[PDB]
Structures are given as C-alpha cells and as structure tokens.
Design a protein around this ligand. Structure first.
Ligand SMILES: C[S@@+](CC[C@H](N)C(=O)[O-])C[C@H]1O[C@@H](n2cnc3c(N)ncnc32)[C@H](O)[C@@H]1O
Ligand SMILES: C[S@@+](CC[C@H](N)C(=O)[O-])C[C@H]1O[C@@H](n2cnc3c(N)ncnc32)[C@H](O)[C@@H]1O
Lengths: 220, 258, 258, 220
C-alpha cells in the first residue's frame, strides 16, 4: 500500500497489494464514510477512495483530463448534486476555503445530500430547478467552475443560462453530455457553446461510463 | 436615477449602473426570517427590507432580477423593469464575501459562511417538507379518484347487466367479472355472434365457453336492433375506459408514493 | 319413411316427398291458442299438434321448414333435417283454401278466410304490444343510464375541482359549469398556458377572460409536473366523454320514444 | 265529371271540371275514407281517387306500365305495406275473392295498417321482417303476385328469397328499386333476377317519384 500525488492538486493515487491503481482524495472529515467507499490510512493521513464507475469526474481523470479546474480554494456551482457521491470529493479537493454550491431538483435524492452537507461545512445544498437560476440567485455567489450533470435533453443552454448568471469571466465549465474524427462527433453542442464559450477538451467516458461524455470549456 | 435592486441573503442593496452602492438595508441575522423571506421572493414578493429601502431611496426607475417582482412593485408606484443577468448583479456576486462585512451583516468571512451554511440547511429542509406535503396531497387525490372509479364501475356495470339482460339475461350469472362482461357486450354485441373462436380471445376454457354458447342458443331474451346494441355499447366502452384509467392511476400512484 | 312437416294455422300436417298427406292433426278453432302457438313456433317450439302427430306417425326422418325447430325435435329423439323452401311446402300452399276443408279445420272457404282474417288481427295486435313493451323497456334503461351518468359527472367533477385546486384553486368558483371546467383542465393544463386567445375557443367574453387570467397571474396554487397534470387529465377527459355519451343517449331516447 | 274504364281491370279514370285526369279505384267500402283521399260519386258507384304522388303503383300506371298483374281475384304478397295507402287500392282491384297479405316491420306504421285491414276483409296484416319469410309462412299462402317496396340496400335477394317460398310458377313480381340506353342502367339488379327470373319492364317513376324505379318480372 502507498499513496501518491497525481498531476492535479489534492488528487492522489493508491498503489495496492494486488497490483491495481485507484483514485483517491484526502478526507476532509476523518473516520466518516460517505457512500460505502473505502477509507485508507497512509502516513497518518486518511484518504477516501474515488470510484470511477460511480463518479463521472474520476472517470474523466483516468480517461486523461489534461487540466482539472477543480483545485484548492475553488468556488464551484454543481448542477445535479444527486445523493452527494462526487461533490463530496470536490469538497475534499476544494478544502475548507473553497465552496461548493449544490443544486438538486429531486426530493428523494436531496434528502441524502443533506446528510453529506451537514458534516461538510463547504457544501451548500439547494433544492431547486437548474432551469431557474433566479430561484437560488439570492443565496449563491459567483464561481470559478460550473459543473453540470443533468439527464436533460437541453443540458447545454441550461448550462449557458447559468454561466451568464454565475460563472466568472475566464472561469471554466464541465458539462456531461449524452472514433476517427476529433470533435466533429459533437458539433451540435461544440458549436452552441462557441457562440460565447471556448472548448478545451471533450472526453469519452468509456468503459467507466458508457452513455456520457464530458466537455471542458472556457467562458470568454 | 436608475437603480438596480439586489436582494440577497445579506439584505436589500441599491446599486447604480456602474455597480456602486447607493444605499442598503441589512437583513436581521435570523434563520427563520431570511428563510421565509426567500420563499415569498421566489413567487415575487419583495423583501420587507426592500420595501424600506425603496422608500428612503425612491428612484426614477428600479431594475430587478426576478420578473415576477415587476408587477408586484408596479402596485407600489415604481417604474420597474427586468434585466435577467445584468453586469451589476454579477458585480455584486464577485464581491460577496467582502460586502457582507461592508454592510455589517457579518463581522468576518468565517461567520458569513457559517451563517450561509446554517441557512442553506434550513431553506432546503423547509422546501423538502413542502415538496413532500404537495406530493402526497396529489397522491390522496389519485387514491380517492380510484375509489370514485371503483364505485362508478359498479354503478355502470350494474346498469349494463340489467340493460343487456333484455337480450341475453342468462349471461349475467355466467360472468362474475365486470371487465369480462363489458368486453363481451363491447366486442360481440348480439348473443348470436358468440363463437368458440371469439370467446377464446378472452381466455375462457372449454367448460366456460360451452356453457355460454349453450345459454345463447337456448336464450330467453328478446331480439334487438343495431341502434339498441349501439346505445348499450356506450356504457360497455365507458366501463372498459375506466378500467384502463384505473390502471394508469395506479402506475402514477406507485411512481409518486415511491 | 321420410316425412315433411307442415305447420300452419290449420294444424300439423305430415307429407311424403311427393306431396301426399300421410296423417294430420287439426288445430282447434281458437284464436288465443293458435296465436300463442305461432309465437313459440317463431322461436322454434313445435305445435302441441305436432307433438301428437309425430307420435302416431313416428317417421324415419322428418324434414322441417324452420331450422330453430331442428334441435328442439332432436331432443325428442327424431332424425331431423332442414329444407328451406321445399317443393312439398309449396304444394301445401298451392292447395290452401281447399285442404283447410279436407282436414276439417274449416267448413267452407268463406269461413276459412273469415277465421284467417280474425287471426291475423289478433296475432299482429299481440306482436304490437310485445314490441311496444320491449321498446320502452329499452328506453327506461337509457333514461336510467342518463341518471347514472349525471350522478357520475357530479362525482368526478367534484374530484377534479378538489384535485386541480392544488394548482389553481381560484378557478373552481370562476367556472360553474362542469363541462367548461373539465375543458380548461383537459385543453390547457397549466394555469400558465391560459391566454386571451385560447379562452375565446370556449366563448367567454372580456369580463370572464380577464377575471380568469387575473386569477392565474396572482394565483396561490402550487407548481405541478407534467405527470401530475396528466393524471388529472384522465379524470377531465372522462368527464368530457360522459357529456358526449349523455348527448348520444338523448338522441337514441328521442328517436325511440318517438 | 265522368269516370272511365282504363286498359286494366278495375282501374278507372276521372275526368274533371278543370280539365285534368286522375286515377281511380272502385271503393270496396262505401262512404269510408282511408288516407284523406277524395270520394267521387258517378252513376250510383263510389270511387276512391288514387294519388300518384303518394302511391308508387299509380305512378307506374301513368308512366306506362303495359300490363298490370294485379286484377280481380288476384292473390298478392305485399312487402312494405306501410300505413296502407297503396294496398288499400289493391284491395279495391283484387275485390273480395282476391287476398292481399301485407307484411310490415315498423310498429308505428303497422298500427295504422290495422285500421285499414279491420274494415277490409281481404287485407291480412302482419308485423314481421321480410328478411324472415319463415316467420309468416304459417299464415300466408302461395300468391300470383309479389309486390315489394322496402327501403333496403338488398331489396332484390330479399324479394327473391320470398319468391321461392310464396310465388306461383309463372307468377309476377313488382320490385321498387333505388337516359338513352334501355336497361343497361339497371344491369346489377336486371341480371341478379335473371339467374331465375324474367324482366318484362323497368319503369322510371319521375316526376311522380324522383328516387325510385319499378321492375316487373316473371318467375320461370
Ligand atoms: C446524471 S445524475 C447526477 C449525478 C451526479 N453527478 C453525482 O453527484 O453523482 C442526474 C441528477 O440530476 C437531477 N436533476 C434532473 N433535473 C434537474 C434539474 N432541472 N435541476 C437540478 N437537478 C436535476 C436528477 O434528480 C438526478 O439525480
Ligand atoms: C318505401 S316505404 C313503403 C310504402 C308502401 N309502398 C305503401 O303502401 O305506401 C318502406 C316501408 O317498408 C318498411 N320496412 C323496412 N324494412 C322492412 C322489412 N325488413 N320488412 C318489412 N317492412 C320493412 C318500412 O317501415 C317502411 O314503412
């Protein structure tokens, strides 16, 4: 067993007895589990395993996300917070001086997002529809990063609408979308952003997620 | 004197077009008040802090962040317009730990965010309860409509049985199930159309079929015209529609009570 | 010994294949008996004169004029077949004043036809009464189904009003008529879809429309999802279907009571 | 005023003061009206006017029916007897030794056919469907003439079915059906009869009846 700093701030790797690598974040709340994930103890510090099969972001890292905009002190707006699997990890990376605002629509799911945010002072949970940023505008703040993961046919403009409210100029957005070319494949969404954004990377999430891809962008 | 209205957790702030504070009224540091004030503001009700601010300022035109507030403030005698994602409101959010301190809502950053965190937990708990209350207000209605439909099925199907019995009285005791009975009237009409082959479409076995065919052959009922059957079929098809409607409501009820 | 069964007003006659009388049993000259005997024979019940004749003759095979009599006589142990418009039955009708005399039903022609005429007046009067009795047995059913539908409309529409009121409670007192109310839910769903232009499709004038639009704007109700509206619309459309069904029954009722 | 014997037995013509001709039958029941028609008194005998606008048969006569099979002593089966307008006239022609069997389906209409038949000993009324000749077979008799006037899409085979039960060989049938050719116009019905019948005349009933035509036939 061993734990190693990656390319990216606050993101680590475990080396295992069996010969496999797993992604890894430093636990902001020692001894306390989040979603069944394993706790690992290396050199006095406790790390939470980051399962790439459950989390799209961990997926992207291993699929070769070049630069990760989520670092220490980062302010993030996370649309589609769900039960808290992946924001819990951004909260680890962000550390205490960063802030994660988590928007979620579904009552059942939100109820579990409360448990996570109660123990994590940098997570601010909101039951709200991401279609109406005017309904949490009175609570949030401008952010460095817009993370967006909804299962909606119109994720992009929704993301764009949110961006013009909340994203700092020269901030970044990660958007979760539904072989020999580069990004002709995704011109529809590629272009629609370009009317005001700047693509840096499109990542296919196979075999971690076999339904979705990720777009990293830059707001001009 | 064109003013931009900013309404935040921290209170009511008046800005000019270049993002300078003209005047402000800070919210009280009370979880309950801010929570309930934010709820009404989703509907477009101005903060009580806004009402006071728009008095001691009283500008030529106010611009607002939420277009449901427009007609509410146009009842107070203000010239009111809507700008969705204005530069000025962005300028407010860019400065947002700091100005909480400047307008004296928070003594420092650590306590601004401690309060912000307490706040978001209350606000979403509130919205949870009320989303749960509405959801199952809708579910009891679905439940009661199913009761209404049950009652109606028994009503119409007892009417059909008496009505259709003028033609084929024997069938009523031969078909217990209201849906099966309605199906026979709807599908075949005349007791003279009933064949072995058609009754299999309802899944009856040999004994049921030969009993029913026997009853139609030896039947005591009256001859009826196509207009007579037709009118009876309006009731029969309504019964079928209601079985259908009942099943769809049960799907709705599960998915939502879930 | 193949026999052809002839059953007439005059009685029961047995014929051979060449149109010769083998044996006969004459009807009594009683209007009531012959009338009611002819009625059951339409259903396929043999004359009581036939039953006696088929005893003292008892042939190898009997052929009959009405195929509903076939299974009835195959319960008495006769070999029975059907010939629709046989030469022998025609031969019987060609000889028909005369044979009424030959088998002693009538003393002469004048009284055969005097009796035939009395008979046809009774027989059709009987069939008139019973056609009138059946017709308006069917009409009371139509009447009672309309009552059932009325009652059901009030039931479902009171359910819709309570259910839909969670979204738009203001509308219930603004629309008295159950059909108009159901139409608004069915047609437009969300109180947010209501426009001037769409409410005109229901024929409301300026005052009604601006009241309803005003209520939707200032509404107190809750936000609802497309699944929620959808379920409510199952009730709304059923109400519309029933208004439709009621009108069609009233057309049926008039044409028939006519 | 004057009354004249036509070509046809028991069918007469009135000459009027105004210069018009009307068809006419000798009244079998003196002084008694049937359907509002006028009673005329010539040389001790009373005649009932025969309105060609109400009666299809009177229509045919004036449209030039060559031979009329309904004469004195005729036995007739009349399908579609209705309220009694036209059988009342056949009952006049038929006289007492002829017999008219009147079949009618409609209760309302039949109720009025009773009034006519009560006063006319040669009219035998029956509530029955003409589709089921087995339901009056126990009452009628073989006939010289099958008159058929129903408003049914399938009048012809119905007529044919009745014929094989009731019509004497070499008897005749009058059937009421829905410019430069002769009877190509009506080949559908013309032919269907020919499979066992023999057309003698097809008569257009305009302007007396502008919806129907009449076929006179012979059963072989
Ligand atoms: C693809 S999953 C997100 C999983 C997430 N990345 C996580 O932390 O594990 C989509 C979630 O977004 C939520 N959602 C759907 N529509 C939404 C909306 N309009 N606004 C906010 N959340 C929404 C759904 O309830 C669902 O839980
Ligand atoms: C064209 S009108 C007959 C008028 C007739 N020629 C008269 O005496 O004035 C048709 C009539 O036939 C009757 N009818 C319809 N279907 C019938 C059926 N299946 N059997 C006997 N009569 C029928 C109708 O009730 C209607 O009164």
């Amino acid at each position: 067993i061993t734990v190693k700093q990656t390319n990216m701030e606050n993101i680590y790797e475990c080396e295992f007895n069996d010969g496999s690598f797993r992604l890894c974040t430093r636990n902001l709340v020692p001894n306390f589990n989040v979603y069944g994930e394993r706790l690992i103890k290396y050199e006095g510090v406790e790390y939470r395993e980051w399962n790439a099969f459950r989390s799209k972001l961990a997926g992207a890292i291993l699929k070769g996300l070049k630069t990760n905009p989520i670092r220490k002190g980062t302010k993030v707006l996370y649309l589609g917070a769900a039960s808290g699997t992946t924001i819990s990890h951004v909260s680890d990376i962000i550390e205490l001086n960063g802030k994660a605002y988590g928007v979620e629509f579904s009552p059942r799911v939100v109820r579990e997002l409360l448990l996570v945010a109660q123990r994590r002072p940098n997570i601010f949970p909101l039951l709200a529809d991401a279609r109406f940023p005017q309904s949490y505008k009175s609570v949030v703040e401008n952010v460095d990063v817009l993370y967006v993961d909804i299962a909606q046919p119109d994720q992009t403009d929704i993301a764009i609408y949110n961006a013009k409210f909340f994203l700092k100029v020269n901030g970044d957005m990660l958007l979760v979308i539904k072989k020999d070319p580069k990004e002709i494949y995704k011109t529809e969404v590629e272009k629609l952003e370009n009317s005001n954004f700047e693509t840096i990377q499109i990542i296919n999430l196979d075999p971690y997620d076999k339904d979705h891809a990720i777009v990293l962008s830059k707001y001009k | 004197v064109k003013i931009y209205l900013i309404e935040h957790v921290i209170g009511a702030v008046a800005y000019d077009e270049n993002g300078n504070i003209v005047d402000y009224i800070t919210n009280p540091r009370d979880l309950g008040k801010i929570t309930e004030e934010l709820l009404n503001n989703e509907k477009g009700i101005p903060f009580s802090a806004t009402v006071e601010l728009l008095k001691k300022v009283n500008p030529q035109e106010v611009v607002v962040e939420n277009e449901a507030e427009v007609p509410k403030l146009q009842a107070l005698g203000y010239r009111v317009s809507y700008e969705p994602y204005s530069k000025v409101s962005r300028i407010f959010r860019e400065s947002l730990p700091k100005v909480a301190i400047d307008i004296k809502f928070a003594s420092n950053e650590e306590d601004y965010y401690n309060f912000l965190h307490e706040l978001s937990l209350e606000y979403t708990r509130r919205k949870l309860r009320s989303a749960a209350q509405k959801r199952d207000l809708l579910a009891i209605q679905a439940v009661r409509a199913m009761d209404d439909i049950d009652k109606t099925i028994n009503l119409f199907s007892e009417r059909l049985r008496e009505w259709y019995s003028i033609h084929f009285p024997e069938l009523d005791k031969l078909i217990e199930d209201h849906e099966e009975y309605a199906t026979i009237v709807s599908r075949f009409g005349d007791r003279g159309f009933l064949t072995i082959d058609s009754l299999k479409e309802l899944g009856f076995n040999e004994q049921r079929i030969n009993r029913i065919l026997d009853a139609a052959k030896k039947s005591i009922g009256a001859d009826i015209s196509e207009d007579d059957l037709s009118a009876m079929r309006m009731i029969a098809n309504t019964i079928l529609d209601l079985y259908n409607i009942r099943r769809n409501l049960n799907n709705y009820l599960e998915g939502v009570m879930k």
